[PDB]
Design a protein around this nucleic acid. Structure first.
Lengths: 202, 382, 122, 52, 52
RNA sequence: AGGUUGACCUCGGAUCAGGUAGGAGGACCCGCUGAACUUAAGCAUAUCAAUAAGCGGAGGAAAAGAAACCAACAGGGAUUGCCCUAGUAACGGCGAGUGAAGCGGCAACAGCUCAAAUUUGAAAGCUGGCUUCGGCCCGCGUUGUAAUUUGGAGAGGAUGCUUU
RNA sequence: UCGUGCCCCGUGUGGCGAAAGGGAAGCCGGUUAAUAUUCCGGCACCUGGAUGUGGGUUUUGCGCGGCAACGCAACUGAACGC
C-alpha cells in the first residue's frame, strides 16, 4: 500500500520535496478561482481516510479563505458604547476558516452534502482547503449502506450547523471534566441550569 | 402600430443560401448534399437575390426555409452522429491496440464494402418520397437507367463492388419479373445503347442500358453524388421488386445460386418459386447464340417473348439449354460473323429486335449472314 | 333539456363527446343572448348547460388520462402530472429497498444470530 | 492573449523549470530511451490482462 | 443538440384558453348600439378583455 | 502518410439524457453574531447576559452518543432527562454577586461503520442506455469499486463439533 | 476530393431609466344626453412586403444637358471607410 508512505511523507512538511510541492501548488491554486472543482484529490490518503471514494457521486472542491481575525462591521471601525480596551483587529471568530470554507463550498454546490474537508496548503493571505461532497441523489450513493445515511433530510447542511469535524471541534463536543459547559450543547446546558423547576407537591 | 424594419419579411424569410442551410442543420457539406438528394430538396431562385443576401452571386444556391425546417426533423441526422461517434470509438480501439474491440465495433458500422447495402437505411425516405406505387412506377425510368448503368462499372470507394453486385442482383430480379409476366413491349438499339419499354400496371416504363463494354468515368461528373443517387435507387428497387413479386404471388427474394453465378449464369442463377399473341412469338423455336452476339439482351428479349430453349456458346456462361452447336434440335442461330448446318435458320441479331417490335416473324433471307440488313426503325416514334 | 348526466357520458368515446360539448357551448352562446333579451323559467337551462359542459370536460379528461396511464404503465419515465403527488419530502425520501439494504457482514451476523424467542422460568 | 487555463498550464511548466527541483522529483525526468521502451513494451504486450 | 426528452413534461396538451364562445359574451342592448345598427351597419358586442 | 495518425491529462460548450437547490414556517432545536436599560452610592473589572434584537441551517423532535470518560474504590462503564449532590467546591472592584462536576436513586436502554493489508489463480463492484426481461452495450473505476478486519480485537495456524 | 474542412474581421458585450428631451405618418365638415385629429362622409399620408403594367437605360453596356453654380420622372452598386 502506497498510502502508508504518503501518510508518513505528509507528516514531514518541512522537507525539501514537500516544501517544493507546497510552493508550486500554492502558486497554482492562487492563480485559480477562489472556489473551483478539483478533478482528483491532491492528498488522496487524507481524502480516503476522511471518507472519499473513487465512486460516482463523490466530488472534491478546492477553496481558499482569507486568514486572520474578524472585524466587526461598525462605521469607521469604532464602537460608541462603553470602552472595550481592545480594537477590532484582535476580534477572533469562534469558528474556523475550515468551517467558512465548508459553508462557502456548500453554498456553491447546494445540491450536494458536505462530508468533510482538509487543509492542503496556506500562505500569508489565504488558507487552502479541499472539501469532499457526496451527491445524495445518485443511485450509487443511495444503494450503498455505508454512505446513504447522508441521503436522509436530517443531514441537510451539516457544515451550516456544525455537524462536521471542525464543527464538533468548535462546539467542544468532547467527553470529560474539561468540557462540562459544552458537551451536551452550551445553550441547552445553560437553559437546563437556569430553568426553575416547580413540582406539584413541593 | 410599430413600424416594420427592412429585410425582416418576404424573400429574406422565404429563402436561405446553402451556407446558411448547412450552418442551420449543423452538417458537413457531403452530408448536407446527400440528405438533400435523398429527401428531394431542390435548388430555388428568388426574384431578387440581393433581398435574400447582399453577398450572393450567380453561383449562389438557394433553398426554401420550410424545406430546411423539414430537414431539421429527419432521423438520419442522429444516424450520422452515431456513425461519427462509432468511427471515433474504432479509432480509439485501434490506437490502444484492442483489435478484437475494433473488429466488434466495426461490425456495428454496417459498411457498404462488407454488406453490399447503403450505409444508412432509407426505408422511411422511400415512403416519404413516393406516396403511391404509381409514383414509384413513374420514377422507375430514372431508377432503372441509373442501376443498369451502374451494374457494369468498376469498384470505387463511393460505390463498392458488393454494392455493384447488389445492383446487378436487383436488375436481374426485375428482368426475371418482366420475363415471367411478359410485360416487355418494345426494344430499340440506338448508337448510345439499348432502349427497353415495358408496361407494368398500366405505366409505360422506358429505360436505357449501355452496351457491355468498358464504361468511361470522366471528371466532368460528380461520381460521389451519383453514388448517393444509386443508393437511393437500389433502396427503391428492392421495395418495388418485393411488391411486384408479392402481387404476382412469388417468393421474394428469389433463390440465388452462388456456384452458378461464379460459373457465369447471370440471369440463369435465379430460381423463381411459387409462394406457399405476342407473348408466345418464339414459343416453338430453339435458339443458339454464338459468342459474338449480345447474350444478356438476346436472352432477356427471347425469354420475355416466349423462348423456353435458348442455348449459347460455352464461354458465354452456365445455364444454356444446350452447349454444342451440333444439336439437331436447334431451329435458329444468332450469329454476327462475316459451313452452315442444314435445317437451321442463321440470322443476325437485328431480326430478333425487328420481330419483337413488329410482333410478327420477319423473313430470314433479308437477315441472312453477310447480307445488307434492313433499316432498324424506332418503335417509339410513329 | 340541458341536463346531461354522467352515466350516459361514461359510455361514449371522444368524437361524440366533442360533438356534445360543441352543441352545449352553442346552446349556451345563443341563450346568453336570450338571457340579456328576456327572462323567466329560462335561466335554469343555462345553469344546466354550464354544469353539463363541466361534466363533459371532466369525462373527456378522465378517459384520456386513463388511456395515457395505460400507455405509460410499463415505462421508466412518466409525465410529471401522471407521477404520484405525495409530498416533496416523501418523493425525496429513500426507497424501501435502499433503506432496507444492509452490508454483507451484517447479513451474515443476522443469518447466524437473530433475535430469538425465549422465556425465563419463575 | 490565451485563455486562462492554457496560460496556467504553460506558466506551471515554466515555473517548474525555473525553480530548483529536489532530487526525489528531479529523478523522474530521466526515462528509458525509444529502443529500450519498445523492447519492454514488446515483452509486456504478450502478458496483457484478461479481457471481458 | 436540440432536446429529445425521454418523457413529456406535460402529458395533456391544453385546450385553447380563449375560444369563440369565451370571446363573444353578449351584444349591447343599449340605445347607442341600437342607433349604430341602422346609422352605421355596426353591431356592438361585449367581449372578453383579453381578446384583440 | 510521420509536416501524419492517435493515446492520455486538464479545461470548456450544448434549450444534450436524467436529476437536485432556492421560498415559506421557525413555539421547541443546532450554530454565528451580539447590546443597553438594570444591579453595583456614582462608575471604565463586574451584573443584567455568554440574554433581547440581527444572520445562517433541520426535524417530529433536534442535538448528543457508544470514552484519548469518571475515578483512586472491594473500582464503575455510550448518550439524554428527573431527584439529589448543592447554593456546595470554586470565582469576584471599593462587593454587589455568581456558581459547576464525580458518586447515588430513577425514567429509558442498543449497538456499530470506515482509513490504514495484495482478489492478484483472474474488479469478484457500480451509474446510465437498449431490451425479446435471457441479457447486451456506452462507460466509472487499478491515483482502487466488491468480499475480509476496526482494538471488544483481529490475521495466520491447529482442532473437533455445532449454525443457516 | 487526401470530400467530414478552410478562410475573413474586431467592436465589444445585457437590461431598466423622459405621457415637457429625440422621434415615420391626418386634415376639413357633420354627428351624441354624455366620445371624438378616434365615430360618419370626403380627401390624404407613413411604414413594411410581394409582384405586375407603362415609361426609362442598353448593339458606344450601367442617362443626357449646362463654361460654371447645377438641372431633369427614372438613371447599377457588396465589403470596408468618410
Amino acid at each position: 500500500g502506497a498510502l502508508k508512505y504518503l501518510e508518513e511523507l505528509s507528516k514531514k512538511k518541512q522537507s525539501d520535496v514537500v516544501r517544493f510541492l507546497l510552493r508550486v501548488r500554492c502558486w497554482e491554486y492562487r492563480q485559480l478561482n477562489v472556489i473551483h472543482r478539483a478533478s482528483r484529490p491532491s492528498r488522496p490518503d487524507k481524502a480516503r481516510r476522511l471518507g472519499y471514494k473513487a465512486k460516482q457521486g463523490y466530488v472534491i472542491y478546492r477553496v481558499r479563505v482569507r486568514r486572520g481575525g474578524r472585524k466587526r462591521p461598525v462605521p469607521k471601525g469604532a464602537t460608541y458604547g462603553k470602552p472595550t480596551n481592545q480594537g477590532v483587529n484582535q476580534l477572533k471568530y469562534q469558528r474556523s476558516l475550515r468551517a467558512t470554507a465548508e459553508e462557502r463550498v456548500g453554498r456553491r454546490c447546494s445540491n450536494l452534502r458536505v462530508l468533510n474537508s482538509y487543509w492542503v496548503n496556506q500562505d500569508s493571505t489565504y488558507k487552502y482547503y479541499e472539501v469532499i461532497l457526496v451527491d445524495p441523489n445518485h443511485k450509487a450513493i443511495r444503494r450503498d449502506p455505508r454512505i446513504n445515511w447522508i441521503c436522509n433530510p436530517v443531514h441537510k447542511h451539516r457544515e451550516c450547523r456544525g455537524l462536521t469535524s471542525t464543527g464538533k471541534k468548535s462546539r467542544g463536543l468532547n467527553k470529560g471534566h474539561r468540557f462540562n459547559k459544552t458537551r451536551a450543547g452550551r445553550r441547552k446546558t445553560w437553559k437546563r441550569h437556569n430553568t426553575l423547576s416547580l413540582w406539584r407537591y413541593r | 402600430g410599430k413600424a416594420k424594419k427592412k429585410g425582416k419579411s418576404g424573400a429574406a424569410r422565404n429563402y436561405m443560401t446553402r451556407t446558411q442551410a448547412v450552418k442551420k442543420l449543423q452538417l458537413s457539406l457531403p452530408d448536407f448534399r446527400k440528405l438533400c438528394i435523398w429527401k428531394g430538396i431542390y435548388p430555388r431562385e428568388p426574384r431578387d437575390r440581393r433581398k435574400v443576401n447582399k453577398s450572393a452571386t450567380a453561383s449562389t444556391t438557394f433553398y426554401y426555409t420550410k424545406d430546411i425546417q423539414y430537414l431539421l426533423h429527419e432521423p438520419l441526422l442522429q444516424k450520422f452522429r452515431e456513425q461519427k461517434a462509432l468511427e471515433k470509438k474504432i479509432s480509439r480501439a485501434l490506437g490502444r491496440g484492442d483489435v478484437s474491440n475494433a473488429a466488434r465495433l466495426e461490425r456495428n458500422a454496417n459498411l457498404p464494402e462488407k454488406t453490399g447495402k447503403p450505409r444508412y437505411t432509407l426505408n422511411h425516405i422511400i415512403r416519404e418520397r413516393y406516396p403511391t406505387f404509381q409514383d414509384a412506377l413513374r420514377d422507375l425510368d430514372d431508377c432503372l437507367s441509373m442501376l443498369f448503368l451502374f451494374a457494369n462499372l468498376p469498384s470505387t470507394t463511393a460505390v463498392p463492388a458488393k454494392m455493384i453486385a447488389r445492383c446487378e442482383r436487383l436488375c436481374h430480379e426485375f428482368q426475371h419479373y418482366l420475363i415471367v409476366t411478359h410485360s416487355l413491349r418494345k426494344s430499340f438499339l440506338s448508337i448510345k445503347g439499348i432502349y427497353y419499354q415495358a408496361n407494368i400496371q398500366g405505366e409505360d416504363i422506358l429505360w436505357l442500358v449501355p452496351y457491355k463494354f468498358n464504361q468511361r468515368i470522366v471528371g466532368d461528373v460528380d461520381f460521389r453524388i451519383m453514388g448517393t443517387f444509386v443508393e437511393f435507387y437500389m433502396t427503391l428497387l428492392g421495395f418495388v421488386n418485393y411488391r411486384l413479386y408479392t402481387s404476382i404471388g412469388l417468393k421474394y427474394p428469389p433463390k440465388f445460386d452462388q456456384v452458378k453465378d461464379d460459373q457465369g449464369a447471370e440471369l440463369a442463377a435465379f430460381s423463381l418459386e411459387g409462394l406457399n399473341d405476342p407473348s408466345q412469338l418464339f414459343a416453338n423455336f430453339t435458339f443458339f447464340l454464338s459468342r459474338e452476339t449480345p447474350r444478356q439482351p438476346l436472352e432477356f428479349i427471347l425469354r420475355a417473348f416466349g423462348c423456353k430453349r435458348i442455348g449459347w456458346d460455352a464461354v458465354l456462361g452456365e445455364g444454356a439449354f444446350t452447349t454444342d452447336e451440333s444439336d439437331p434440335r436447334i431451329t435458329h442461330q444468332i450469329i454476327d460473323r462475316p459451313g452452315r448446318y442444314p435445317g437451321r435458320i442463321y440470322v443476325q441479331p437485328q431480326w430478333v429486335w425487328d420481330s419483337i417490335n413488329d410482333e410478327e416473324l420477319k423473313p430470314p433471307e433479308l437477315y441472312a449472314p453477310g447480307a445488307q440488313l434492313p433499316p432498324h426503325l424506332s418503335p417509339f416514334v410513329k | 333539456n340541458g341536463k346531461v348526466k354522467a352515466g350516459q357520458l361514461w359510455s361514449k368515446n371522444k368524437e361524440e363527446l366533442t360533438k356534445i360539448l360543441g352543441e352545449l357551448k352553442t346552446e349556451l352562446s345563443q341563450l346568453r343572448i336570450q338571457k340579456i333579451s328576456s327572462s323567466g323559467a329560462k335561466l335554469n337551462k343555462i345553469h344546466d348547460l354550464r354544469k353539463s359542459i363541466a361534466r363533459v370536460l371532466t369525462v373527456i379528461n378522465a378517459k384520456q388520462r386513463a388511456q395515457l396511464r395505460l400507455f405509460y404503465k410499463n415505462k421508466k419515465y412518466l409525465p410529471l402530472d401522471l407521477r404520484p403527488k405525495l409530498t416533496r419530502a416523501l418523493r425525496r425520501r429513500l426507497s424501501k429497498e435502499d433503506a432496507s439494504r444492509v452490508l454483507e457482514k451484517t447479513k451474515k451476523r443476522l443469518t447466524h444470530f437473530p433475535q430469538r424467542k425465549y422465556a425465563v422460568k419463575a | 492573449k490565451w485563455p486562462e487555463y492554457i496560460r496556467l498550464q504553460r506558466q506551471k511548466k515554466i515555473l517548474r523549470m525555473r525553480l530548483k527541483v529536489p532530487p526525489a522529483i528531479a529523478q523522474f525526468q530521466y526515462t528509458l530511451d525509444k529502443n529500450l521502451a519498445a523492447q519492454a513494451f514488446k515483452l509486456l504486450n504478450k502478458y496483457r490482462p484478461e479481457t471481458k | 443538440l436540440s432536446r429529445a426528452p425521454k418523457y413529456p413534461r406535460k402529458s395533456i396538451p391544453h385546450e385553447p384558453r380563449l375560444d369563440e364562445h369565451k370571446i363573444i359574451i353578449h351584444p349591447l342592448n343599449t340605445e347607442g348600439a341600437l342607433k349604430k345598427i341602422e346609422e352605421q351597419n355596426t353591431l356592438v358586442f361585449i367581449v372578453d378583455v383579453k381578446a384583440n
